[PDB]
Structures are given as C-alpha cells and as structure tokens.
Amino acid sequence: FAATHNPWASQAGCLSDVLYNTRHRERLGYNSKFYSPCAQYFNTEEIIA
Amino acid sequence: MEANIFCTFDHKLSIADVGKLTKLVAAVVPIPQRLHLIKHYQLGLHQFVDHTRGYVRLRGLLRNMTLTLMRRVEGNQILLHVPTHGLLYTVLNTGPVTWEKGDALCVLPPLFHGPLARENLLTLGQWELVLPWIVPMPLALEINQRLLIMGLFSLDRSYEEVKAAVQQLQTITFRDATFTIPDPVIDQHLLIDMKTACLSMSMVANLASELTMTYVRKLALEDSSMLLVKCQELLMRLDARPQHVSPDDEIARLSALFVMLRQLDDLIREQVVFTVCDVSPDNKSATCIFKG
Amino acid sequence: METHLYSDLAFEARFADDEQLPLHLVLDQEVLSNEEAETLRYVYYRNVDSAGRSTGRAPGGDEDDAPASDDAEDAVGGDRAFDRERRTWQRACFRVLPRPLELLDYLRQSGLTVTLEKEQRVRMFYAVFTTLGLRCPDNRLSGAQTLHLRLVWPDGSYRDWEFLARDLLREEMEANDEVARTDEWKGAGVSRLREVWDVQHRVRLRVLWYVNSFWRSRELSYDDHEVELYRALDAYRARIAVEYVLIRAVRDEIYAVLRRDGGALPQRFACHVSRNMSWRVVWELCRHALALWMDWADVRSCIIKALTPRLSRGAAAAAQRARRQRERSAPKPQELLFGPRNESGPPAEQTWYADVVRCVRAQVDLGVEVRAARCPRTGLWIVRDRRGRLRRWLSQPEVCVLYVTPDLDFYWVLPGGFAVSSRVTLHGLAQRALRDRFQNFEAVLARGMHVEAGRQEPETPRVSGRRLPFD
Amino acid sequence: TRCLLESVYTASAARAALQWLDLGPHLLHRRLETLGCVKTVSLGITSL
Amino acid sequence: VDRWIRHAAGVERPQLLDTETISMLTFGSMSERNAAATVHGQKAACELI
Amino acid sequence: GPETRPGIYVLTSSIAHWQTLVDVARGKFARERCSFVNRRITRPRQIP
C-alpha cells in the first residue's frame, strides 16, 4: 500500500522504464536479437493490451 | 385517430435488412406527421440531420416530432405503433446509456461515445435509419443545462479561452460512461432561450424576498460546514431583527418567485416520455409506462 | 433607438469605475456601403489621449515603445503584444436599420420628442446605430483627446476612423407611482444634431445629444490647451507615417544593394533572354518604374500586407516550430525504422504578395497575390497566379515587379528576371507603431457561429431590409 | 496514393527496405532484379 | 572518454560497416561470440536495474 | 539539381521490336533525357 518501492523503475519515464521498455528502447540503437528477462515487466503496451 | 401506422419501402429488401428490422422490434422511432401511411424517406432522423445546423436545432425539431414503437415488421411492411398515455409498453433501448429501475426517460439527439464507430446501420444507398437516444432524466437535463451554460458563457469570449472551456464542458460522464456534445452552436433558438433565462434571472433578482438575499449570510455567521464553505466561496468573489416583517408580503413574493423559477426551470427540463419499471439484466430492454 | 438608451444606462452604471461618458453616433451611406452595413459584425472604439497614449497601456511608458529587430522568433513582441492590443480595444452595442429613412421623421414616429432648432430633414438610405465612450481620468475632460472608430465584418476585415474631441464637442460643453427612466428619456427627447468629420476629412457621421443623458449632471469641466493640441497633432503625424517610412526603408535598401553589387544584377526568376536586346532602354525603364513605385506606394503595398500576418499570435509559435524543424541534424536510423513518420518539411510552393508597376501607361497594382515555386531544372523562381496560371508580366518589357516573401525578404525585378534582393528593416520603428496601426482582428464569439473553433462557417447572419424583418 | 500506401506499409522491414533503396549510391535498376508474378499466401511470422 | 571507458569495461570500439549493417542490426542481428569451453550451460544474463 | 528522383511506370504496348519501342520511349521521355544532358553538362567529374 505504498506508491512504489523503486521510483527509478516504477515511473512512466524512469531510468529502468526507458532502458527496458521496447516502446522506448526501439527509439535507441537497440539490437532485438538478445532476450531480456525484464522485457515482460517493462513492456507496458503488451501487458496493457 | 390511428392506433396503427404502416410504413412501406420503395427499395427492394435483403433478408439481412429484414432480419435487422425484426430485431429492432419494440424500439422507438420518430415520425414527423402522426399519419396513417408514410414513405420510408420521412422515417428516422437522417431526414433532418445537417451537422452544420447544430445540436440545438435538431433538439428543437425532435421535441416537436412524435414518437412510435416498432411492431409486426415483415417484407416491405413496417407497421409502427403509436403508444397512448398510461399503458404499459415494452421498449428496447438503443444507446449505450445504462437504464436503472425507477428512472424517467427523455428523448434527445444521439451524442458521441468512445468506440467512435457511429455504426452506419441500415444504409439504403443514401437513406440511413438514424435513431434517437432515449435518456434518463439526470443525464438529459445535464445536456440541456450544459448547452445553456455554454451559450451563456461563450458570448464575447475569445476562442482560446473557449477552447479549454468547451474541452471541459462538452465532456459528460454519467454512470462511468463518456459522452460529449456533438455540435454546440449559437443559433437564434438558443439565443431566445438565453433571453428567457436572463429575463427570469432578472425577475428573481428583483421580486425575491428581502431576507432570502441575506439568509445565506446569517447562516454563515451561524454555521461553518463544507457545504456552507462552498456556498460562501461562491458568493465571496463579490464580498439581528428585520425592521419589518409581514407574512402576506412574503407569501406573495415567494409565489411570484416560484412562478419565475418554474419559468426558468423548464428551459432545462425535458417532458418525460417513459417511466421504467423493469430491467433486463443485460440492460438491452425495459418495460415502461408512457407519458404524453 | 434602443441602443442609445441602453448605452446611456450602461455607461451610467459603470461611470464609477471606468469614468467614460457615452457619445451616441448614427452613421449612413457616407462611411460604409450598404453591403457593409448589411454584413456588420462588431463595432469597436479606442481612446487616445493628448499624449498619444492608448487607454489600456501603462501611463508612464511601456516596453512596446521599444523597437523591434526584424527577427521572426520574437515577432513584434509575440502573443503578449497581441493580448495588450486586444485589451485596449473596447466593444459597443449597435443596431442596423436597412430601410431608407430620415432621422427626424423616424424619431418623431418613435416616442422621442425631437426639439432641433430648425426642421431640416436629413435623409439616409440605411442607418447603423452605435454609442461610443470617451474617458476622462478625473472630472476634467480634454479637447485634445481623440477617439477611434472601427467597423468589423465577418471576413475579419475592418476600417479605421479617428476624430478628436474638439470636433465632437465643439459647442456641447459651451451650452452649460414611480417614474421609469425610459418615460422621462422619451419625454425629454433630443435637441442638437451635428456632423463630425475624421481628421483626414474622409468620413461624415452624426452625433445625437439627448438632454436626459446622465453625463449632463456631473458638472464636468472641459478645456483645450494649445500646446496640448499641438502634441496631439504631432502624435497623429507620428501614427500616420508607419507605412510610408516602411516604404522609404525599402527604397533606401534597394538603392544601397544596387550600389553594393556594382549594378550587376543576377537572375533570380526564370525567364529566357537575348544577347541582342537593347538593355539600356530596360535600365531606363527600370529607373522610371522605380520612381513611379516611390510615388504611388500606398498603405496596401505588399510589404505592409506581408507584415500584417507576422503580427498575429500564431507567428511566434510557428516561427519556433519552423526553426526547430530546420535546426536538425541527419536523422538517426532508429527513428527512420521505428516510431512516427517524419515531420513534413516546408512545402515546395509559397504564397507571396507583390507590387507591379507599368511604364507604358501610368498604372500600378498593389494588393496582388502571387504563388512562388522553384523551377527544379534551374533552381530559379517561377511566379504562378492564385488559380495556378503562369504570370506573364515577367516577359512584358514595360513592367517591373517588387516581390516580398513571408519571411520579409524582398525581390526587385526588371524585365528578364534579373533581380535585386535585400531584407526588410523594420528596425526603424517602435513596436507600438507597427502593433497599433496594423493587426488582424481576432474573432470573439457571437450569434450564428460554432463554439468549436475551426468548424465550417455557417450562413452569414446578414440582417437585411430586402426581406421581411425576421423574428 | 503515396500517403495511403505509405500508411498501410508501416513495419520495420518495409522502412528498412526503403532505407536500403536509397542508402547506396547506385541507381534503382542495378539494385533491382525482377521476379515473376505471385500466387499464394501462407501468413506467418515468416510467410511463404 | 569513450576509449578509456571501453578499455576499462573490456569491449571493442563499435566496428561496423555502418550504413547497411546498422540497418540490418536494428532489423535484427546475432553479434556475440560463443565462449570456448562450457561446462555450465546457457549464459543466464543477469540484467541489472 | 541535388538528388535523383526516379519515375517508375508499367507500359502496355503492341510494339515488340526493340528499336521502335526505344524510339517512342525517347520521344515521350524527352524531358528526362534533356535533364540528363543538363546534369552531364553542368556537373563535371560526376557521371550520370
């Protein structure tokens, strides 16, 4: 019942979000061939849909 | 005169359209004339709906238009039925508005909604059976009140301020739905409505009981509550015995004030057409008593 | 009739704060055409004191008095100057009467008892009724004050008239159950009717003096000091000269760059040429055409018409967006493969305004619109008409044309497309003069128009007298 | 039509193909070699 | 700064025939060498947030 | 001037022989050929 436990991972535009959300990572020079364990958590669009 | 109305189509009908017609049984459709026999062109609201002439014009036309229920429809014979006052009828709702038991229903032009489709149902090449919204009293009077407030505020204001004002005002939520007024336009119809509203407000300012102006302030000296905090906050932007008191004067003044209020009130109130006492658990139909 | 009475009541109500007294005006076929009266939207007035200061700008001087420096980013002050000039303009209540009438008979036919000295009937084909206010900061009113008048039509067009107090009040200040104010207003009537003229002596308009006007009783004082009127005259001279000093700046820039380039003029508009044409005659025709343009340039020259949209509030945001879109490096591959489609670059076609001058017969055209596109095979300019037709006046040997771009770059052209190019220097004048003399009207909501901005314009209201009056 | 089929052909592969068409210095005909006409689709992650 | 950081972290300068290869990489590309000897299996890349 | 914009067409024609087809193509695409010569003249050390 807090707001978060990692503000650098829970915000809409925090460091971890831009780092691992593919909707933000595709803006960067990112190579899609590598699997990332935290893709499922930070890919907000896919889980929302 | 007529308890039965027969509508016939010039076009040949497909079995898909016949199925849609036999599904639309018990719905409400408007008729301009209240006559024995009409062609299918003058059925529905596609006849009148020029979006350039905004929502106020269509509302004024629709409230003069008469209503009828749907019936024994078959191949190229519709057979609409006009309900009489006081009987119990089965009516099928078509809009996304949720109907709950005990609410009174009103007729209004359809509003916008989230799924953005608008569903161009029953297009006979050009003619398209656009059907009105049947709305419970709070939301419908909210439409009317917001339109009147829109007209009263918008005059002598720039489009930039009006942009935010309409972006907040045009959107209404009722039972967690999301609607917005299609076309707010300042026609002579709304201008005359505002003329009536301004005259009524001037009269209620003039003839009102002298103590009812200061009752709020006496209570504010008496009390301190969230309701009264908001009441004072409204009047704050412009901010003991009475030397005489006579009950007859107060009685006459409040009778006049009630006349003026009832004059102002029905600029927002819509003449109820149906009162519900039944609901299907899927909200798709309800049983209602008709008011004329 | 009703506008004058209502305006008297309304100015009486607010005189405590605004301290403006009402002045009732009726106008006829001398100020505006029948079409303009039939299609009038708003009437506006603005007061300028004897110091040349508008009512609505800081008394001690403002930052608008500072000059503007030609940059499109801070376009003549941005949106804040537009908001200030919006604040200074005040709106009056007006009525339109489209059927022919004479005021004496019309008022006698109404409840008002006119009591003029002589029964001279004054006829007019149509009457527009309005009442404007002029502010006295204290109980003293000055005869060197000047009042501006504006009529606004639904197309956003407007016309400016200004007249000073001493013409408006030449003789007026020297002439010094329960009753409803309407009853005594009608029973007291009016007796004095005078003609007022604009300072330039271009518009005639009538003023009515109702004896029961509330401004009578305040025993206000009036005077017109000579030095005060001299100040008003020199301030008016300063106001009127904006377009002419801009044109002179264009002249001096043209001559300066013609001196700088040694007279060698390179081609900037695509046109075929011949080595064996006599160009000396072309040069002398250019001289004569330039002199004629210097003579006949008007307030509606292309440079002012192009300056006008630069002052609208949209210009500053548009300039920021355009500069940021130009201020870009090469796009990264990531944005090309993924995300939104690329921002649309500036179009291959532009809208221009130009002045065309003829030497064969004395004739110039000033408010000419032209569309400009670059010829791909040569990189030079091609001038197209508003319908898309090609402009042939480039070929015509007797014609020289001055073009102005939206970004205030101007081309001077003699036959053959050989051109003289320079930038407009609006540095010469204060921001106040440019922002006051020219500015697009911004619409305020009224009857018959959509509340949602950007929607299609409905039928123009067009209160008319050729139809039966509508109710 | 350009806007229409540019909107319909929105994908990483199509944008990459349009990039490759213009990244090089050569003409279209040298980069392009023609194949015949098509008849079948078996839609998948990689379609046949 | 880039050269010192890459030396400290032990990674090569991004040697790529940039124009075509980068578009291929962002389209998808396999780019990391296999280690010679593996007795424990697939490399569980602990992705850090 | 700065960069080549190519045009692509699909032509239906009863002309099978190469020479007549090239003749009519050169006649209809005269502007493109003229621009080719223009670029070849204006810009040395580049080879269209």
Swiss-Prot record, chain B:
Pfam families assigned: Herpes_V23
Any GO MF annotation of the entry: structural molecule activity
Biological function: Structural component of the T=16 icosahedral capsid. The capsid is composed of pentamers and hexamers of major capsid protein/MCP, which are linked together by heterotrimers called triplexes. These triplexes are formed by a single molecule of triplex protein 1/TRX1 and two copies of triplex protein 2/TRX2. Additionally, TRX1 is required for efficient transport of TRX2 to the nucleus, which is the site of capsid assembly.
InterPro entries, alphabetized: Herpes_capsid_2
Cellular compartments per GO CC: host cell nucleus; viral capsid
Name of the molecule in the record: Triplex capsid protein 2
Subcellular compartments: Virion; Host nucleus
Family stated for the protein in its record: Belongs to the herpesviridae TRX2 protein family.
Alphabetical UniProt keywords: Capsid protein, Host nucleus, Virion
Major subcellular site: virion
From Swiss-Prot, chain C:
Keyword Lyase: no
Gene Ontology biological process terms from the UniProt entry: chromosome organization; viral DNA genome packaging
InterPro entries xref list: UL17-like (IPR007640)
Metal-binding is among the record's keywords: no
Gene Ontology CC annotation, any one: viral capsid
Residues passing through the membrane, by range: none
HAMAP family, A to Z: HSV_CVC1
Protein name: Capsid vertex component 1
Source organism per UniProt: Human cytomegalovirus (strain AD169) (HHV-5)
UniProtKB/Swiss-Prot annotation, chain D:
Record localization: Virion; Host nucleus
Family: Belongs to the herpesviridae TRX1 protein family.
Assembly mode: Interacts with TRX2, MCP and capsid vertex component 2/CVC2.
Protein role: Structural component of the T=16 icosahedral capsid. The capsid is composed of pentamers and hexamers of major capsid protein/MCP, which are linked together by heterotrimers called triplexes. These triplexes are formed by a single molecule of triplex protein 1/TRX1 and two copies of triplex protein 2/TRX2. Additionally, TRX1 is required for efficient transport of TRX2 to the nucleus, which is the site of capsid assembly.
Name by which UniProt lists this protein: Triplex capsid protein 1
Species of origin: Human cytomegalovirus (strain AD169)
Lineage, opening ranks: Viruses, Duplodnaviria, Heunggongvirae, Peploviricota, Herviviricetes
UniProtKB/Swiss-Prot annotation, chain E:
Interval of the full protein contained in this chain: 1127 to 1175 of 1370
Organism: Human cytomegalovirus (strain AD169) (HHV-5)
Family indicated by similarity: Belongs to the herpesviridae major capsid protein family.
Function noted in UniProt: Self-assembles to form an icosahedral capsid with a T=16 symmetry, about 200 nm in diameter, and consisting of 150 hexons and 12 pentons (total of 162 capsomers). Hexons form the edges and faces of the capsid and are each composed of six MCP molecules. In contrast, one penton is found at each of the 12 vertices. Eleven of the pentons are MCP pentamers, while the last vertex is occupied by the portal complex.
Gene transcribed to yield this protein: MCP
Listed name of the protein: Major capsid protein
Record's subunit section: Homomultimer. Makes the hexons and eleven out of twelve pentons. Interacts with triplex proteins 1/TRX1 and 2/TRX2; adjacent capsomers are linked together in groups of three by triplexes, heterotrimeric complexes composed of one molecule of TRX1 and two molecules of TRX2. Interacts with scaffold protein; this interaction allows efficient MCP transport to the host nucleus. Interacts with capsid vertex component 2/CVC2. Interacts with the small capsomere-interacting protein/SCP.
Protein location: Virion; Host nucleus
